[PDB]
PDB file of C-alpha atoms in Angstrom:
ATOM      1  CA  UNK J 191       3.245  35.425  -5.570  1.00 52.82           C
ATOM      2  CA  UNK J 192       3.455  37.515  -2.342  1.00 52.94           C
ATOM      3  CA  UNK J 193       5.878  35.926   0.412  1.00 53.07           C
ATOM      4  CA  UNK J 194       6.504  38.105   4.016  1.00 51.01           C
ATOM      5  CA  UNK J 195       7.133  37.306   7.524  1.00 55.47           C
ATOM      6  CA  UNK J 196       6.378  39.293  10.578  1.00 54.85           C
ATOM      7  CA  UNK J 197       7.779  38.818  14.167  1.00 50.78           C
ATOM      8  CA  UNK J 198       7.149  41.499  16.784  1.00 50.76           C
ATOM      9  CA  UNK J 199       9.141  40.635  20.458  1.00 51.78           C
TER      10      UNK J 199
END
């Protein structure tokens, strides 16, 4: 299982 997140502001 692969878990990310990505937030670019």
């Amino acid at each position: 299982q692969y878990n990310n997140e990505n937030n670019f502001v």
